[PDB]
Amino acid sequence: APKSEVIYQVMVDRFYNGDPSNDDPEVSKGMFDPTHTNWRMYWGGDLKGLTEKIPYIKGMGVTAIWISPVVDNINKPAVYNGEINAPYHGYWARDFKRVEEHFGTWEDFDNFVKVAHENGIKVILDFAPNHTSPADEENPDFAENGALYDDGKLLGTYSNDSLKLFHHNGSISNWNNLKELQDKNLFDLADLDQSNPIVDKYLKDSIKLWFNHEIDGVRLDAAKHMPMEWVKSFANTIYSIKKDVLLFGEWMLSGPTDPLYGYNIQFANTTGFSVLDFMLNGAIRDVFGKGYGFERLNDTLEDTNKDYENPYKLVTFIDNHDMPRFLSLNNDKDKLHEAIAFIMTTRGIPVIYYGTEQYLHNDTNGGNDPYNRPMMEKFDESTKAYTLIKELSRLRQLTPALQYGTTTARYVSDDVYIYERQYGKDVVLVAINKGEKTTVKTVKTSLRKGIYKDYLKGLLKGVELKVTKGNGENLVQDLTLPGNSVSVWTNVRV
Ligand SMILES: [Ca+2]
Ligand SMILES: [Ca+2]
Ligand SMILES: [Ca+2]
């Protein structure tokens, strides 16, 4: 009876500012914008603020918070074209053994973990061991020159790499060559050389430190840019210190025809890390955000379920901090609700990017980075999306069928998708109609004969199901699905 999870993804600087005293710390001053009009500066969200909002997050049935990296990031900005670029997102580390002072101290981090755990919520740390920070090997005055510190002790810089901590191979230019992706710099980010025993020990010591502060898992940033065999050894290190851990990597795929898809599969099948589900994400955005027919979604789903050895550990999502938010792609709240209902009732672990439930989006530059990281604005626990996100996670706790069940398509047309999830005798049947009101002629199901009410109680216009005994598979006849509706039927007692 494995535990089912539901993840909430928080960019700390953009979520809630609970402490004004760390907005603009003396050691790293001048990268804070109180007005929230320069989108590349720190805006002030912090660990105290996130801790204060744990009840709000718990109210959605979230079981785990994926926190953006909270390791100490560079204390001087990367100035390009005179533009101040602050490491507000956390992906430009200077010290993997310290907490970022804009977000808090070790005590603030321990309190956050304490309160999360008291609420039944795991802490998943976004960890980015591929690189430190932007560097120019010929200009040590730019940013912090990729500096790596060990709990305040400087280990070296990109321009003076006495310990040979970094690759000095230029930047990635051939993005389909695996060796280039691993051994060169992602943009101007100083690439760490995990083959160096110094770097290898440092990163493994660092992750042990964070697990000493009782985190529950890791989201591995830039997983395609490190040697697969090193990542596997990193996973082994983690497994040796905590058995019940949630490990998944960000292996970006560009689309259905990504030449490296097979390495992504190998990674997910062998390293000990699962992966974020970019194949399914593309189909989700195609069919709910771009008008494609459900055959695309169901086809992608069937493919991923046979390619990955453990699809039940894929981490699914509709948007994130590296792509436009769903509402920037298609400002349709009904389509958003349908996509949420889909990932919540689909195998694996669904992710809600913070503020989705508040319909948060900024459409500047198409909603792309940085505008997909707006400040959280409201904490309204009565929105339709909040209610939806809180109800379906309850079904995940009542049956493994949603995270761990088989998937059987019962009806696939352009705008109607009826699929069935089964685990043991547990069955959940879901019908999504993203088009106009229509009547489906015949659907088979393994639900027993009877009348099933909509689990969502009409929240998304759902309707009852009249299942007749078929002898063999049971039958529904002449089912009328309202326009823009989701109906969820289950034999699991609620
Ligand atoms: Ca603050
Ligand atoms: Ca810092
Ligand atoms: Ca690398």
Side-chain angles (χ1 to χ4, degrees), residues 288 318 326-327 332-344 356-359 383-389 392 432 456 459-460 484-486:
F288 295 108
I318 302 158
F326 181 85
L327 291 176
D332 189 318
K333 293 181 189 64
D334 299 320
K335 290 291 179 302
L336 173 65
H337 297 150
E338 290 150 21
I340 294 166
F342 175 69
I343 65 168
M344 290 285 189
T356 302
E357 72 277 8
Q358 303 298 324
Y359 311 108
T383 76
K384 176 164 295 187
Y386 190 104
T387 304
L388 173 65
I389 293 165
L392 285 175
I432 303 186
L456 292 174
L459 177 66
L460 309 182
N484 267 332
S485 67
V486 181

PDB file of all heavy atoms in Angstrom, residues 288 318 326-327 332-344 356-359 383-389 392 432 456 459-460 484-486:
ATOM      1  N   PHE A 288      -4.853  20.806 -23.912  1.00  0.00           N
ATOM      2  CA  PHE A 288      -5.643  21.778 -23.155  1.00  0.00           C
ATOM      3  C   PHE A 288      -5.280  23.227 -23.465  1.00  0.00           C
ATOM      4  O   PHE A 288      -6.110  24.122 -23.260  1.00  0.00           O
ATOM      5  CB  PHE A 288      -5.499  21.550 -21.635  1.00  0.00           C
ATOM      6  CG  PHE A 288      -6.061  20.238 -21.156  1.00  0.00           C
ATOM      7  CD1 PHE A 288      -5.220  19.212 -20.751  1.00  0.00           C
ATOM      8  CD2 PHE A 288      -7.438  20.036 -21.099  1.00  0.00           C
ATOM      9  CE1 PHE A 288      -5.727  17.993 -20.314  1.00  0.00           C
ATOM     10  CE2 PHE A 288      -7.958  18.821 -20.651  1.00  0.00           C
ATOM     11  CZ  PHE A 288      -7.104  17.803 -20.257  1.00  0.00           C
ATOM     12  N   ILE A 318       1.866  20.750 -15.321  1.00  0.00           N
ATOM     13  CA  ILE A 318       1.286  21.523 -16.415  1.00  0.00           C
ATOM     14  C   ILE A 318       2.181  22.688 -16.821  1.00  0.00           C
ATOM     15  O   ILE A 318       2.262  23.031 -18.002  1.00  0.00           O
ATOM     16  CB  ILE A 318      -0.112  22.028 -16.012  1.00  0.00           C
ATOM     17  CG1 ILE A 318      -1.001  20.838 -15.653  1.00  0.00           C
ATOM     18  CG2 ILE A 318      -0.722  22.914 -17.125  1.00  0.00           C
ATOM     19  CD1 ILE A 318      -2.163  21.254 -14.764  1.00  0.00           C
ATOM     20  N   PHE A 326       0.374  27.997 -17.590  1.00  0.00           N
ATOM     21  CA  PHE A 326      -0.700  27.529 -18.457  1.00  0.00           C
ATOM     22  C   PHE A 326      -1.596  28.675 -18.912  1.00  0.00           C
ATOM     23  O   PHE A 326      -1.942  28.762 -20.096  1.00  0.00           O
ATOM     24  CB  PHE A 326      -1.549  26.460 -17.773  1.00  0.00           C
ATOM     25  CG  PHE A 326      -2.636  25.947 -18.670  1.00  0.00           C
ATOM     26  CD1 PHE A 326      -2.375  24.932 -19.563  1.00  0.00           C
ATOM     27  CD2 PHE A 326      -3.894  26.534 -18.671  1.00  0.00           C
ATOM     28  CE1 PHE A 326      -3.369  24.467 -20.436  1.00  0.00           C
ATOM     29  CE2 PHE A 326      -4.887  26.081 -19.553  1.00  0.00           C
ATOM     30  CZ  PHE A 326      -4.618  25.049 -20.418  1.00  0.00           C
ATOM     31  N   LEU A 327      -1.981  29.562 -17.996  1.00  0.00           N
ATOM     32  CA  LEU A 327      -2.873  30.661 -18.358  1.00  0.00           C
ATOM     33  C   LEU A 327      -2.219  31.671 -19.297  1.00  0.00           C
ATOM     34  O   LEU A 327      -2.939  32.428 -19.958  1.00  0.00           O
ATOM     35  CB  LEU A 327      -3.391  31.368 -17.111  1.00  0.00           C
ATOM     36  CG  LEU A 327      -4.360  30.506 -16.303  1.00  0.00           C
ATOM     37  CD1 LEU A 327      -4.763  31.206 -15.018  1.00  0.00           C
ATOM     38  CD2 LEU A 327      -5.602  30.106 -17.165  1.00  0.00           C
ATOM     39  N   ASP A 332      -7.784  30.267 -20.187  1.00  0.00           N
ATOM     40  CA  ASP A 332      -9.067  29.579 -20.076  1.00  0.00           C
ATOM     41  C   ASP A 332      -9.067  28.787 -18.767  1.00  0.00           C
ATOM     42  O   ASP A 332      -8.428  27.735 -18.678  1.00  0.00           O
ATOM     43  CB  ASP A 332      -9.289  28.662 -21.280  1.00  0.00           C
ATOM     44  CG  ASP A 332     -10.690  28.097 -21.332  1.00  0.00           C
ATOM     45  OD1 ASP A 332     -11.213  27.696 -20.267  1.00  0.00           O
ATOM     46  OD2 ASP A 332     -11.268  28.049 -22.440  1.00  0.00           O
ATOM     47  N   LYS A 333      -9.800  29.281 -17.766  1.00  0.00           N
ATOM     48  CA  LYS A 333      -9.817  28.613 -16.464  1.00  0.00           C
ATOM     49  C   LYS A 333     -10.498  27.246 -16.524  1.00  0.00           C
ATOM     50  O   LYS A 333     -10.138  26.347 -15.755  1.00  0.00           O
ATOM     51  CB  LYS A 333     -10.491  29.511 -15.431  1.00  0.00           C
ATOM     52  CG  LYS A 333      -9.711  30.792 -15.097  1.00  0.00           C
ATOM     53  CD  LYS A 333     -10.453  31.606 -14.045  1.00  0.00           C
ATOM     54  CE  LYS A 333      -9.838  32.988 -13.825  1.00  0.00           C
ATOM     55  NZ  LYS A 333      -9.925  33.856 -15.034  1.00  0.00           N
ATOM     56  N   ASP A 334     -11.482  27.057 -17.408  1.00  0.00           N
ATOM     57  CA  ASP A 334     -12.058  25.720 -17.560  1.00  0.00           C
ATOM     58  C   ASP A 334     -11.030  24.727 -18.081  1.00  0.00           C
ATOM     59  O   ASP A 334     -10.991  23.573 -17.642  1.00  0.00           O
ATOM     60  CB  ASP A 334     -13.265  25.744 -18.501  1.00  0.00           C
ATOM     61  CG  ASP A 334     -14.376  26.618 -17.994  1.00  0.00           C
ATOM     62  OD1 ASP A 334     -14.635  26.607 -16.772  1.00  0.00           O
ATOM     63  OD2 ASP A 334     -14.991  27.317 -18.830  1.00  0.00           O
ATOM     64  N   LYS A 335     -10.209  25.145 -19.051  1.00  0.00           N
ATOM     65  CA  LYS A 335      -9.175  24.257 -19.558  1.00  0.00           C
ATOM     66  C   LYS A 335      -8.136  23.964 -18.480  1.00  0.00           C
ATOM     67  O   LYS A 335      -7.637  22.834 -18.369  1.00  0.00           O
ATOM     68  CB  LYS A 335      -8.521  24.895 -20.786  1.00  0.00           C
ATOM     69  CG  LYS A 335      -9.438  24.945 -21.997  1.00  0.00           C
ATOM     70  CD  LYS A 335      -9.681  23.553 -22.524  1.00  0.00           C
ATOM     71  CE  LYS A 335     -10.612  23.555 -23.732  1.00  0.00           C
ATOM     72  NZ  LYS A 335     -11.925  24.169 -23.410  1.00  0.00           N
ATOM     73  N   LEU A 336      -7.794  24.979 -17.690  1.00  0.00           N
ATOM     74  CA  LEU A 336      -6.879  24.788 -16.571  1.00  0.00           C
ATOM     75  C   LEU A 336      -7.435  23.766 -15.579  1.00  0.00           C
ATOM     76  O   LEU A 336      -6.734  22.828 -15.182  1.00  0.00           O
ATOM     77  CB  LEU A 336      -6.618  26.125 -15.880  1.00  0.00           C
ATOM     78  CG  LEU A 336      -5.802  26.005 -14.578  1.00  0.00           C
ATOM     79  CD1 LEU A 336      -4.394  25.507 -14.882  1.00  0.00           C
ATOM     80  CD2 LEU A 336      -5.777  27.327 -13.830  1.00  0.00           C
ATOM     81  N   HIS A 337      -8.705  23.923 -15.185  1.00  0.00           N
ATOM     82  CA  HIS A 337      -9.315  22.966 -14.255  1.00  0.00           C
ATOM     83  C   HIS A 337      -9.285  21.551 -14.822  1.00  0.00           C
ATOM     84  O   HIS A 337      -9.023  20.581 -14.098  1.00  0.00           O
ATOM     85  CB  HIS A 337     -10.761  23.377 -13.934  1.00  0.00           C
ATOM     86  CG  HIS A 337     -10.877  24.685 -13.228  1.00  0.00           C
ATOM     87  ND1 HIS A 337     -11.969  25.511 -13.377  1.00  0.00           N
ATOM     88  CD2 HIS A 337     -10.043  25.316 -12.369  1.00  0.00           C
ATOM     89  CE1 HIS A 337     -11.798  26.597 -12.646  1.00  0.00           C
ATOM     90  NE2 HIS A 337     -10.640  26.502 -12.022  1.00  0.00           N
ATOM     91  N   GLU A 338      -9.518  21.412 -16.128  1.00  0.00           N
ATOM     92  CA  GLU A 338      -9.491  20.094 -16.739  1.00  0.00           C
ATOM     93  C   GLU A 338      -8.084  19.497 -16.717  1.00  0.00           C
ATOM     94  O   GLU A 338      -7.916  18.292 -16.463  1.00  0.00           O
ATOM     95  CB  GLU A 338     -10.042  20.179 -18.164  1.00  0.00           C
ATOM     96  CG  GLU A 338     -11.539  20.459 -18.189  1.00  0.00           C
ATOM     97  CD  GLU A 338     -11.992  21.234 -19.419  1.00  0.00           C
ATOM     98  OE1 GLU A 338     -11.276  21.235 -20.440  1.00  0.00           O
ATOM     99  OE2 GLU A 338     -13.064  21.863 -19.345  1.00  0.00           O
ATOM    100  N   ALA A 339      -7.058  20.315 -16.982  1.00  0.00           N
ATOM    101  CA  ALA A 339      -5.688  19.805 -16.932  1.00  0.00           C
ATOM    102  C   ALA A 339      -5.281  19.417 -15.507  1.00  0.00           C
ATOM    103  O   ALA A 339      -4.613  18.395 -15.307  1.00  0.00           O
ATOM    104  CB  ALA A 339      -4.726  20.847 -17.505  1.00  0.00           C
ATOM    105  N   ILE A 340      -5.664  20.229 -14.515  1.00  0.00           N
ATOM    106  CA  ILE A 340      -5.433  19.876 -13.110  1.00  0.00           C
ATOM    107  C   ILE A 340      -6.091  18.543 -12.783  1.00  0.00           C
ATOM    108  O   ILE A 340      -5.454  17.622 -12.257  1.00  0.00           O
ATOM    109  CB  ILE A 340      -5.943  20.992 -12.183  1.00  0.00           C
ATOM    110  CG1 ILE A 340      -5.123  22.268 -12.355  1.00  0.00           C
ATOM    111  CG2 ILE A 340      -5.874  20.530 -10.714  1.00  0.00           C
ATOM    112  CD1 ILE A 340      -5.749  23.478 -11.741  1.00  0.00           C
ATOM    113  N   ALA A 341      -7.380  18.410 -13.106  1.00  0.00           N
ATOM    114  CA  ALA A 341      -8.058  17.144 -12.853  1.00  0.00           C
ATOM    115  C   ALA A 341      -7.337  15.989 -13.531  1.00  0.00           C
ATOM    116  O   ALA A 341      -7.198  14.909 -12.945  1.00  0.00           O
ATOM    117  CB  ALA A 341      -9.522  17.229 -13.300  1.00  0.00           C
ATOM    118  N   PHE A 342      -6.819  16.211 -14.748  1.00  0.00           N
ATOM    119  CA  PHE A 342      -6.099  15.142 -15.434  1.00  0.00           C
ATOM    120  C   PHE A 342      -4.866  14.693 -14.646  1.00  0.00           C
ATOM    121  O   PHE A 342      -4.697  13.495 -14.382  1.00  0.00           O
ATOM    122  CB  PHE A 342      -5.705  15.568 -16.849  1.00  0.00           C
ATOM    123  CG  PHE A 342      -4.852  14.549 -17.552  1.00  0.00           C
ATOM    124  CD1 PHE A 342      -5.386  13.332 -17.942  1.00  0.00           C
ATOM    125  CD2 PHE A 342      -3.498  14.787 -17.782  1.00  0.00           C
ATOM    126  CE1 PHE A 342      -4.604  12.377 -18.565  1.00  0.00           C
ATOM    127  CE2 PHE A 342      -2.717  13.835 -18.405  1.00  0.00           C
ATOM    128  CZ  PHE A 342      -3.261  12.630 -18.788  1.00  0.00           C
ATOM    129  N   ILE A 343      -3.965  15.625 -14.297  1.00  0.00           N
ATOM    130  CA  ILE A 343      -2.731  15.148 -13.666  1.00  0.00           C
ATOM    131  C   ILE A 343      -3.031  14.557 -12.289  1.00  0.00           C
ATOM    132  O   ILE A 343      -2.368  13.605 -11.859  1.00  0.00           O
ATOM    133  CB  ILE A 343      -1.637  16.239 -13.578  1.00  0.00           C
ATOM    134  CG1 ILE A 343      -2.030  17.411 -12.672  1.00  0.00           C
ATOM    135  CG2 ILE A 343      -1.230  16.701 -14.978  1.00  0.00           C
ATOM    136  CD1 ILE A 343      -0.846  18.350 -12.353  1.00  0.00           C
ATOM    137  N   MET A 344      -4.049  15.075 -11.601  1.00  0.00           N
ATOM    138  CA  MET A 344      -4.394  14.522 -10.288  1.00  0.00           C
ATOM    139  C   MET A 344      -4.903  13.088 -10.381  1.00  0.00           C
ATOM    140  O   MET A 344      -4.765  12.327  -9.413  1.00  0.00           O
ATOM    141  CB  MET A 344      -5.444  15.388  -9.607  1.00  0.00           C
ATOM    142  CG  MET A 344      -4.959  16.716  -9.168  1.00  0.00           C
ATOM    143  SD  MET A 344      -3.943  16.563  -7.706  1.00  0.00           S
ATOM    144  CE  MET A 344      -3.761  18.297  -7.306  1.00  0.00           C
ATOM    145  N   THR A 356      -0.925  28.617  -9.199  1.00  0.00           N
ATOM    146  CA  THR A 356      -1.874  28.031 -10.146  1.00  0.00           C
ATOM    147  C   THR A 356      -3.290  28.102  -9.599  1.00  0.00           C
ATOM    148  O   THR A 356      -4.235  28.475 -10.313  1.00  0.00           O
ATOM    149  CB  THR A 356      -1.530  26.564 -10.447  1.00  0.00           C
ATOM    150  OG1 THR A 356      -0.199  26.448 -10.971  1.00  0.00           O
ATOM    151  CG2 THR A 356      -2.504  26.005 -11.492  1.00  0.00           C
ATOM    152  N   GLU A 357      -3.449  27.755  -8.321  1.00  0.00           N
ATOM    153  CA  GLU A 357      -4.753  27.719  -7.678  1.00  0.00           C
ATOM    154  C   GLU A 357      -5.358  29.104  -7.490  1.00  0.00           C
ATOM    155  O   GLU A 357      -6.556  29.201  -7.178  1.00  0.00           O
ATOM    156  CB  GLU A 357      -4.614  27.011  -6.326  1.00  0.00           C
ATOM    157  CG  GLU A 357      -3.892  27.841  -5.276  1.00  0.00           C
ATOM    158  CD  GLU A 357      -2.347  27.791  -5.354  1.00  0.00           C
ATOM    159  OE1 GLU A 357      -1.792  27.231  -6.320  1.00  0.00           O
ATOM    160  OE2 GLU A 357      -1.701  28.307  -4.426  1.00  0.00           O
ATOM    161  N   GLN A 358      -4.564  30.164  -7.656  1.00  0.00           N
ATOM    162  CA  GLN A 358      -5.032  31.541  -7.624  1.00  0.00           C
ATOM    163  C   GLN A 358      -5.099  32.157  -9.018  1.00  0.00           C
ATOM    164  O   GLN A 358      -5.274  33.372  -9.135  1.00  0.00           O
ATOM    165  CB  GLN A 358      -4.130  32.399  -6.740  1.00  0.00           C
ATOM    166  CG  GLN A 358      -3.990  31.891  -5.311  1.00  0.00           C
ATOM    167  CD  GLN A 358      -5.318  31.868  -4.575  1.00  0.00           C
ATOM    168  OE1 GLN A 358      -6.164  32.739  -4.777  1.00  0.00           O
ATOM    169  NE2 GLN A 358      -5.507  30.867  -3.712  1.00  0.00           N
ATOM    170  N   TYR A 359      -4.948  31.344 -10.058  1.00  0.00           N
ATOM    171  CA  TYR A 359      -4.976  31.804 -11.451  1.00  0.00           C
ATOM    172  C   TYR A 359      -3.933  32.896 -11.689  1.00  0.00           C
ATOM    173  O   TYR A 359      -4.166  33.857 -12.422  1.00  0.00           O
ATOM    174  CB  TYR A 359      -6.384  32.275 -11.848  1.00  0.00           C
ATOM    175  CG  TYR A 359      -7.467  31.275 -11.483  1.00  0.00           C
ATOM    176  CD1 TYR A 359      -8.355  31.533 -10.446  1.00  0.00           C
ATOM    177  CD2 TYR A 359      -7.575  30.069 -12.155  1.00  0.00           C
ATOM    178  CE1 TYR A 359      -9.339  30.617 -10.105  1.00  0.00           C
ATOM    179  CE2 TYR A 359      -8.554  29.141 -11.817  1.00  0.00           C
ATOM    180  CZ  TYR A 359      -9.424  29.428 -10.788  1.00  0.00           C
ATOM    181  OH  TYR A 359     -10.383  28.503 -10.452  1.00  0.00           O
ATOM    182  N   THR A 383     -11.211  29.611  -3.979  1.00  0.00           N
ATOM    183  CA  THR A 383     -11.272  29.570  -5.433  1.00  0.00           C
ATOM    184  C   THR A 383     -11.666  28.178  -5.905  1.00  0.00           C
ATOM    185  O   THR A 383     -11.442  27.170  -5.220  1.00  0.00           O
ATOM    186  CB  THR A 383      -9.934  29.964  -6.082  1.00  0.00           C
ATOM    187  OG1 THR A 383      -9.001  28.882  -5.966  1.00  0.00           O
ATOM    188  CG2 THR A 383      -9.355  31.219  -5.446  1.00  0.00           C
ATOM    189  N   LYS A 384     -12.291  28.131  -7.082  1.00  0.00           N
ATOM    190  CA  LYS A 384     -12.654  26.843  -7.659  1.00  0.00           C
ATOM    191  C   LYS A 384     -11.425  25.951  -7.817  1.00  0.00           C
ATOM    192  O   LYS A 384     -11.481  24.753  -7.517  1.00  0.00           O
ATOM    193  CB  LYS A 384     -13.377  27.040  -8.996  1.00  0.00           C
ATOM    194  CG  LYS A 384     -13.704  25.727  -9.716  1.00  0.00           C
ATOM    195  CD  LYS A 384     -14.746  25.932 -10.808  1.00  0.00           C
ATOM    196  CE  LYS A 384     -16.077  26.346 -10.212  1.00  0.00           C
ATOM    197  NZ  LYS A 384     -17.148  26.386 -11.243  1.00  0.00           N
ATOM    198  N   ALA A 385     -10.294  26.525  -8.246  1.00  0.00           N
ATOM    199  CA  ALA A 385      -9.089  25.722  -8.448  1.00  0.00           C
ATOM    200  C   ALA A 385      -8.543  25.189  -7.124  1.00  0.00           C
ATOM    201  O   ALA A 385      -8.109  24.035  -7.044  1.00  0.00           O
ATOM    202  CB  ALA A 385      -8.029  26.548  -9.186  1.00  0.00           C
ATOM    203  N   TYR A 386      -8.533  26.022  -6.087  1.00  0.00           N
ATOM    204  CA  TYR A 386      -8.124  25.568  -4.759  1.00  0.00           C
ATOM    205  C   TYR A 386      -9.005  24.417  -4.289  1.00  0.00           C
ATOM    206  O   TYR A 386      -8.510  23.393  -3.808  1.00  0.00           O
ATOM    207  CB  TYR A 386      -8.180  26.735  -3.777  1.00  0.00           C
ATOM    208  CG  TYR A 386      -7.553  26.447  -2.425  1.00  0.00           C
ATOM    209  CD1 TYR A 386      -6.293  26.952  -2.089  1.00  0.00           C
ATOM    210  CD2 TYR A 386      -8.224  25.685  -1.478  1.00  0.00           C
ATOM    211  CE1 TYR A 386      -5.725  26.699  -0.850  1.00  0.00           C
ATOM    212  CE2 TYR A 386      -7.662  25.419  -0.250  1.00  0.00           C
ATOM    213  CZ  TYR A 386      -6.416  25.924   0.063  1.00  0.00           C
ATOM    214  OH  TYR A 386      -5.883  25.653   1.298  1.00  0.00           O
ATOM    215  N   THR A 387     -10.318  24.562  -4.446  1.00  0.00           N
ATOM    216  CA  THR A 387     -11.231  23.494  -4.054  1.00  0.00           C
ATOM    217  C   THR A 387     -10.965  22.223  -4.849  1.00  0.00           C
ATOM    218  O   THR A 387     -10.944  21.125  -4.288  1.00  0.00           O
ATOM    219  CB  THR A 387     -12.672  23.967  -4.237  1.00  0.00           C
ATOM    220  OG1 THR A 387     -12.850  25.171  -3.488  1.00  0.00           O
ATOM    221  CG2 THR A 387     -13.650  22.916  -3.738  1.00  0.00           C
ATOM    222  N   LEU A 388     -10.729  22.354  -6.155  1.00  0.00           N
ATOM    223  CA  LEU A 388     -10.434  21.183  -6.974  1.00  0.00           C
ATOM    224  C   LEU A 388      -9.158  20.499  -6.509  1.00  0.00           C
ATOM    225  O   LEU A 388      -9.092  19.269  -6.403  1.00  0.00           O
ATOM    226  CB  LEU A 388     -10.293  21.599  -8.441  1.00  0.00           C
ATOM    227  CG  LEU A 388      -9.820  20.535  -9.415  1.00  0.00           C
ATOM    228  CD1 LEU A 388     -10.816  19.390  -9.572  1.00  0.00           C
ATOM    229  CD2 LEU A 388      -9.511  21.187 -10.784  1.00  0.00           C
ATOM    230  N   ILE A 389      -8.114  21.289  -6.262  1.00  0.00           N
ATOM    231  CA  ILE A 389      -6.829  20.709  -5.890  1.00  0.00           C
ATOM    232  C   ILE A 389      -6.910  20.044  -4.524  1.00  0.00           C
ATOM    233  O   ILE A 389      -6.203  19.064  -4.258  1.00  0.00           O
ATOM    234  CB  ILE A 389      -5.739  21.794  -5.938  1.00  0.00           C
ATOM    235  CG1 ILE A 389      -5.522  22.236  -7.391  1.00  0.00           C
ATOM    236  CG2 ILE A 389      -4.435  21.291  -5.320  1.00  0.00           C
ATOM    237  CD1 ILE A 389      -4.731  23.544  -7.514  1.00  0.00           C
ATOM    238  N   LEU A 392      -9.198  16.230  -4.950  1.00  0.00           N
ATOM    239  CA  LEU A 392      -8.713  15.028  -5.629  1.00  0.00           C
ATOM    240  C   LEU A 392      -7.579  14.352  -4.861  1.00  0.00           C
ATOM    241  O   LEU A 392      -7.443  13.122  -4.908  1.00  0.00           O
ATOM    242  CB  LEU A 392      -8.295  15.368  -7.063  1.00  0.00           C
ATOM    243  CG  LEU A 392      -9.461  15.601  -8.043  1.00  0.00           C
ATOM    244  CD1 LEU A 392      -8.972  16.063  -9.440  1.00  0.00           C
ATOM    245  CD2 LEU A 392     -10.311  14.357  -8.205  1.00  0.00           C
ATOM    246  N   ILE A 432     -13.477  13.472 -19.168  1.00  0.00           N
ATOM    247  CA  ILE A 432     -13.223  14.878 -19.430  1.00  0.00           C
ATOM    248  C   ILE A 432     -13.820  15.210 -20.786  1.00  0.00           C
ATOM    249  O   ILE A 432     -13.566  14.508 -21.771  1.00  0.00           O
ATOM    250  CB  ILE A 432     -11.723  15.209 -19.411  1.00  0.00           C
ATOM    251  CG1 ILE A 432     -11.080  14.805 -18.075  1.00  0.00           C
ATOM    252  CG2 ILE A 432     -11.510  16.683 -19.668  1.00  0.00           C
ATOM    253  CD1 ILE A 432      -9.634  15.254 -17.977  1.00  0.00           C
ATOM    254  N   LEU A 456     -16.521  14.760  -7.542  1.00  0.00           N
ATOM    255  CA  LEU A 456     -16.334  16.196  -7.388  1.00  0.00           C
ATOM    256  C   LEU A 456     -17.632  16.943  -7.101  1.00  0.00           C
ATOM    257  O   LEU A 456     -17.600  18.173  -6.980  1.00  0.00           O
ATOM    258  CB  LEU A 456     -15.673  16.772  -8.646  1.00  0.00           C
ATOM    259  CG  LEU A 456     -14.221  16.326  -8.872  1.00  0.00           C
ATOM    260  CD1 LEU A 456     -13.720  16.827 -10.207  1.00  0.00           C
ATOM    261  CD2 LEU A 456     -13.321  16.828  -7.761  1.00  0.00           C
ATOM    262  N   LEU A 459     -18.524  20.064  -9.074  1.00  0.00           N
ATOM    263  CA  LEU A 459     -17.647  21.231  -9.047  1.00  0.00           C
ATOM    264  C   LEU A 459     -17.235  21.643 -10.454  1.00  0.00           C
ATOM    265  O   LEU A 459     -17.148  22.839 -10.759  1.00  0.00           O
ATOM    266  CB  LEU A 459     -16.411  20.941  -8.202  1.00  0.00           C
ATOM    267  CG  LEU A 459     -15.390  22.075  -8.157  1.00  0.00           C
ATOM    268  CD1 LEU A 459     -15.956  23.296  -7.442  1.00  0.00           C
ATOM    269  CD2 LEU A 459     -14.130  21.565  -7.482  1.00  0.00           C
ATOM    270  N   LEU A 460     -16.979  20.670 -11.319  1.00  0.00           N
ATOM    271  CA  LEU A 460     -16.661  20.917 -12.721  1.00  0.00           C
ATOM    272  C   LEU A 460     -17.764  20.370 -13.621  1.00  0.00           C
ATOM    273  O   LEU A 460     -17.497  19.714 -14.630  1.00  0.00           O
ATOM    274  CB  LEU A 460     -15.309  20.313 -13.088  1.00  0.00           C
ATOM    275  CG  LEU A 460     -14.131  20.675 -12.179  1.00  0.00           C
ATOM    276  CD1 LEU A 460     -12.861  20.033 -12.705  1.00  0.00           C
ATOM    277  CD2 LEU A 460     -13.961  22.183 -12.042  1.00  0.00           C
ATOM    278  N   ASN A 484     -17.243  21.443 -21.207  1.00  0.00           N
ATOM    279  CA  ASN A 484     -16.174  21.841 -20.287  1.00  0.00           C
ATOM    280  C   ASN A 484     -16.362  21.207 -18.908  1.00  0.00           C
ATOM    281  O   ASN A 484     -16.364  21.890 -17.883  1.00  0.00           O
ATOM    282  CB  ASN A 484     -16.092  23.364 -20.176  1.00  0.00           C
ATOM    283  CG  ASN A 484     -15.103  23.964 -21.152  1.00  0.00           C
ATOM    284  OD1 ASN A 484     -14.126  23.316 -21.548  1.00  0.00           O
ATOM    285  ND2 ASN A 484     -15.347  25.208 -21.544  1.00  0.00           N
ATOM    286  N   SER A 485     -16.525  19.885 -18.889  1.00  0.00           N
ATOM    287  CA  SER A 485     -16.851  19.176 -17.658  1.00  0.00           C
ATOM    288  C   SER A 485     -15.813  18.112 -17.339  1.00  0.00           C
ATOM    289  O   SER A 485     -15.146  17.562 -18.225  1.00  0.00           O
ATOM    290  CB  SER A 485     -18.251  18.520 -17.730  1.00  0.00           C
ATOM    291  OG  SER A 485     -18.307  17.477 -18.682  1.00  0.00           O
ATOM    292  N   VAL A 486     -15.685  17.832 -16.044  1.00  0.00           N
ATOM    293  CA  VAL A 486     -14.954  16.674 -15.553  1.00  0.00           C
ATOM    294  C   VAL A 486     -15.868  15.923 -14.598  1.00  0.00           C
ATOM    295  O   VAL A 486     -16.412  16.518 -13.660  1.00  0.00           O
ATOM    296  CB  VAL A 486     -13.651  17.060 -14.825  1.00  0.00           C
ATOM    297  CG1 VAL A 486     -12.932  15.800 -14.373  1.00  0.00           C
ATOM    298  CG2 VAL A 486     -12.749  17.927 -15.714  1.00  0.00           C
TER     299      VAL A 486
END
